[PDB]
A paper describes a structure:
Cytoplasmic incompatibility (CI) results when Wolbachia bacteria-infected male insects mate with uninfected females, leading to embryonic lethality. CI is caused by linked pairs of Wolbachia genes called CI factors (CifA and CifB). Protein-binding experiments and expression of cif genes in yeast have shown that CifA binds its cognate CifB specifically and rescues CifB-induced yeast growth defects. CidBwMel consists of a region, which is predicted to contain two PD-(D/E)XK (pseudo) nuclease domains (residue 1-751; hereafter CidBwMelND1-ND2, ND: nuclease domain) and a C-terminal deubiquitylase (DUB) domain.
Of note, the ND1-ND2 region of CidBwPip_I(b/2) (a CidBwMel ortholog from the Wolbachia strain wPip Tunis line, hereafter CidBwPip(Tunis)ND1-ND2) expressed well in E. coli and shares a sequence identity of 71% with CidBwMelND1-ND2. We successfully determined a crystal structure of CidBwPip(Tunis)ND1-ND2 in complex with CidAwPip(Tunis) (specifically CidAwPip_I(γ/2)32). The structure of CidBwPip(Tunis)ND1-ND2 is very similar to the model for CidBwMelND1-ND2. (The residues at the interface are well resolved in CidAwPip(Tunis)-CidBwPip(Tunis)ND1-ND2 with good electron density). Substituting the CidAwPip(Tunis) residues at its CidB-binding interface with the corresponding ones from CidAwMel abolished its ability to bind CidBwPip(Tunis)ND1-ND2 and neutralize the CidBwPip(Tunis)-induced growth defect in yeast. Thus, the structure of the CidAwPip(Tunis)-CidBwPip(Tunis)ND1-ND2 complex accurately captures the CidA-CidB interaction mode and is biologically relevant. Among the positions that show divergence, residues 118, 125, 149, 150, 341, 342, 399, and 400 of CidAwPip and residues 242, 243, 253, 254, 257, 451, 452, 460, 461, and 462 of CidBwPip map to the binding interface of the two proteins. These variations create distinct interaction surfaces for each of the four known CidAwPip_I variants. Similarly, each of the four CidBwPip_I variants has a unique combination of residues at the CidA-binding interface. His-tagged CidA variants I(α/1), I(γ/1), I(β/2), and I(γ/2) cannot pull down GST-tagged CidB variants I(b/2), I(b/1), I(a/2), and I(a/1), respectively, which supports the hypothesis that natural sequence variations affect binding interactions between CidAwPip and CidBwPip from different strains.
Author numbering:
A (entry chain A): 2 to 127, 133 to 274, 288 to 427
B (entry chain B): 4 to 151, 161 to 645, 649 to 747, 750 to 758
Amino acid sequence: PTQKELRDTMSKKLQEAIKHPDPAVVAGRKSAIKRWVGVLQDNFMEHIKYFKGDKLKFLHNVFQDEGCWSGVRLDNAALGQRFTEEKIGGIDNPLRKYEMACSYCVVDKIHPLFQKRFESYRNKFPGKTETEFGKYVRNSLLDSIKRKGPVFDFWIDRESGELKKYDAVEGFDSAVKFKWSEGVEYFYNHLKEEDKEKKLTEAILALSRVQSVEKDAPILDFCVNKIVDKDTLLQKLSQKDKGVYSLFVELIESCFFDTVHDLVQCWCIFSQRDYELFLSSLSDTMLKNPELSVQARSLIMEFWECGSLYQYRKAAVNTSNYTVPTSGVFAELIVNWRREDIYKTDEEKEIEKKEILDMMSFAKDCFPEKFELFKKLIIRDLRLCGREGKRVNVDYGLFAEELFSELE
Amino acid sequence: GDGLIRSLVDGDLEGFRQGFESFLDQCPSFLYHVSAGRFLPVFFFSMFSTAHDANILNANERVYFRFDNHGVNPRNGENRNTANLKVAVYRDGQQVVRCYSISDRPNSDGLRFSTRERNALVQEIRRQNPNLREEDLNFEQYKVCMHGATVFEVIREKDRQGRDKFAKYSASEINLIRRLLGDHRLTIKEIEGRQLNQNQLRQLGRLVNFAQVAQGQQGIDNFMEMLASDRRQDVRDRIRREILPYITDIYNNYRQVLENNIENRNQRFEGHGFLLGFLANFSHRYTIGVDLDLSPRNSHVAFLVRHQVERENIPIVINLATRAPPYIALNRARSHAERLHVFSFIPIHTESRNTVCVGLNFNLNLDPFSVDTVGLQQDRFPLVQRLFECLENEGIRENIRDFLLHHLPAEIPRNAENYDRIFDCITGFAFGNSAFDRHPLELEEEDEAPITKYIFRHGDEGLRCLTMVFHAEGSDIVILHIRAHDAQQQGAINLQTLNVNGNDVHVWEVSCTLNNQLELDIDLPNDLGLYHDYQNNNANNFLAGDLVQVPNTENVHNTLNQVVNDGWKNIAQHRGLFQEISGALMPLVDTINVNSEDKFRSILHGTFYASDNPYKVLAMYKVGQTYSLKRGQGERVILTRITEQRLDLLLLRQPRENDLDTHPIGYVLRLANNAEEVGQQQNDARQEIGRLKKQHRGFIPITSGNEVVLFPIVFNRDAHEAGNLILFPEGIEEHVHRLDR
């Protein structure tokens, strides 16, 4: 299949291990599994692509452990020790331990694990000094493993073979440049207490770009949630072009919803297009992760019902040039409402209804002379575009017409 | 620019010629399909039917059209999906009616406007101007045609006498007369000469009818501004909420006119022509680039909209499916996008890490399109590693096959007439990738093993089979066979030369066969057993031939680091690069059999791919086109001949924040079969470089610098030593080509 499809088959299989009483935790931890495996690009899928049977049972035992979790995020320290054990639960470790010690900054085990790999690779060889040959074998081995990422070339000196030591400032700047989520956390703890706030700000600005990748968002969540004065950070971000917007959409698509709630409540600016895109992004994410429906919906209603954003919500429902800026948002909300692939309480469906209806009432009151077209446009977005979780060969436009009837 | 429809409506033919010339540079694969069904006619129809909505034309400038379908062939009496497009423009208060005929064929029967078409036209003109005087109307008939692909002409027919200014019959009329009579092989003189019955004339009058296009409820003036952005979420919303709903509406609005008087219309090519036309209406205002892939089993189109030289704008990939579910069409669009760096030039004109994918089926009543976002990054496929991994893991064979097939040049058609070209490219690519791989094998059990490569020379000198052996020291051995459809020998390869401690060492075989349908089949890997049991059981089954060890090629990787970077304008660094490549291939010249320019190019292509540097290497890369004009004689004939310019190999770095100069390196490759053929091959290569130096706008979006390096390379098959295997210029300065911005 496609690489994306292989990622989800591994994501969905690793999601079976997640078991918790609260439905919100299970579903937030499922998003972390997709982040760990990779959604739009490969993350740890590179190492677990061929894992089958007992190899997958090892990862099943790791992610089902409460100690490897911290709320809905992965405990990197716990993972680092587990992924460097010889065997847990009687099951051998199928991962490459040196690569895991590098990725999770298990600095006590990096060098002894690399020497094991170096010795077994040297012994497979037949004019060059034995010292120079070892330097050659070390370079050939490190260059091979470096194909999977620059982290695997980070800790081992190529001239002496000794474990490299780094200043926290240098390792922090390198982990951001490497888009290395686990590395950003390790060096932050070793940073000076006065350098912490200044360093986090630099990282947020650098990765809050339009060219961002999903790997940037974990770093952004960690850095934002540890910034003390989010106010002063929001001022510097606004000076950067689309810095606020880029930080927002990155955490939304990666399901860092608690990080955005705290961000939107502080300074209860961004452009009108930014406003409309936040809603479009959330609504899409809602469909890509339907078990997080409530959380995403709640974030939409905060962007919508923010009194300071009154000028933005009115233009959002302003019908102009045979389109309304939020036709998709409405359409995607309706699709969620009619979701029969996942069990939902009838109460949930109902709150989901009055959720939409209150938004349509705002559009009816704001522009009543354009409200007739608004209706045609909404059903247009529901019959012309196919979305995830939307069933085939059923008219979702009839459902919108049902809501319009109740509205009047 | 000034606008294609604008220059056409105003009668500015030279302004239309220069404008259409710029669109042909934007869509380098447009001409390959102008003779495929109604691709070209629907293209121009789209441009006209959407011009009012784009504010290109005013409501005063009325546009009337008609699809003049060809019908049955006079030679074999079979249905044709081709047609001509008759379009006329009338502005109220003006006496000029500009009439246009668009067709693939330069002088197709019925291409001229007919008398009945003139009556059907003036009928539509008066639906708004009832008492209009037709005698005061002056008709200006024009022709626009392109065929082959190599020629594009715009003609203003001379003024003609009354009743001679219009032809007797259009293409559709000629088809109806033949159907009304019995013979389908009636010539024009026959048809024109026969007197027609009054009932037959009524059917002719009911057949010819014109329709009018007008502005819609949705203006599309700024539709390309919405796509010239770097925000994937914005571009996604604009396509899903405004752009595609409009295209779906307009195509479905004129849906009945498309299917009328036509049988077995090519929906793939007509749907793609409609999309290209929509884009062509903005060609004069924006730097658009369209990469069309309409080869058999391909229905993709990828484009990128920019104002000037933005490097982070979001590409869009659309897959058109005539009879497929919308999700299926999106899957195909996502699959194209993941491999967009191999296939397309779009990842060269933008450095965006994401692409907006769109799957479109115009025929569906519900869910005609679906849009999603896919990551865009260049992948490094480890051929030798995946070969070892595919022995215990299923599905890697698909990726291995896709790796070899997708890197085939799109110029070479995958038919029976180019079987040897396809086989030469696949084997040469596979050789360069595997022979020039410096990395060891990453074993499954937390270990690494160095790989010594071998290549086998079959006893039959003229056998189309590439056989290589990869020995992972301390681990298993993999024998790779890439055989032609008839090279199915199953004799065992002697591995006695391989120094193998017995261990748990197994010998594996992976056999690949290119069939007559041009599909590469990779059989299930077979364990041939332990090394010692393999040698004893095949004691009298060893294939006649020699197993030649591949030399170490690690210095080529280090040399390419200097050549691709600081030494890209250094002729001596390039000279040393090919001297080392020559030093590696010389012990293998007989076993490899570089018997064609395709094999030579693919060996180098696989060599530059496997090496970390260059970041990107492309084969048979189209840099652009050249347009030579001819003017003739009122009768105003403008003829444009198009000649393509391609680079055999283009080596590019990746744009980085500190250095945006991709250091483009281009190689013109030729093969000399004999030492006497050498001088002619070198001169031919030097002549092609001189023509490549006439191209500029093709090299400008590929780099931020202002120079390109071009070198002529000749493979000397009869070279005595390695110093003369690959012939490189000795320098007795013509490789650095400054770009005009």
